[PDB]
Write a protein that binds this ligand. Sequence first.
Ligand SMILES: O=C(O)CNC(=O)C(=O)O
Ligand code: NI
Length: 235
Amino acid sequence: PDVKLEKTVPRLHRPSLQHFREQFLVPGRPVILKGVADHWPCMQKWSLEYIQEIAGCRTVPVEVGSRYTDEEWSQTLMTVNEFISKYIVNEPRDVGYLAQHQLFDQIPELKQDISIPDYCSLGDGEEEEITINAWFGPQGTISPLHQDPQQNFLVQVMGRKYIRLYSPQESGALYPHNTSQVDVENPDLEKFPKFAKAPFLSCILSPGEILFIPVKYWHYVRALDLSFSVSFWWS
Ligand SMILES: O=C(O)CNC(=O)C(=O)O
Ligand code: NI
């Protein structure tokens, strides 16, 4: 998608903690951190076949469908192997996603391949209550526009994701059902008049990069290739 024609998220190579707290965290402004996670072992070490070997056997919850309404999506328990088989390799017809699952409690060994970003300590909370999630799905997975109740560090390990960001002081034009009723990349201009002209920031997130997504900031995600991401929810 055309990102050179959109306002893009600012990228910074290893900004100091102070400059992050003051210019981003406190005011709640997105930023892309560069050269912080890119040498994490996960970056080299996590091929499709690496994961398939070590995790292939474990049972994991799988999203079929997109999350616009509760009734509009469903989950299924299968193995990583069944999942990789049915929704990734060869020619998968339907989409399925391994979203928002805590793989690193299920498999503490993988914890050595990632770190907790230093920037987290600027928050009030304790490292132990930080919620790490895995997001592992094929190209074409869509997580609809919504906001989380915490600060977020989303780390991209494998593949690229297109991400769009609307601030919270912009909720009006987004039409909450929280989560939006708008389809960011195919919007009903008339059902939703106020949306076309709401200001956003966007980005293509690549391997090695971290997107800071400020608490309650609205975000929408579409994967551009086979993808693996790790999120840190923190306060
Ligand atoms: O990675 C995705 O598809 C969606 N991730 C998020 O909504 C999250 O990390 O906050
Ligand atoms: Ni989210």
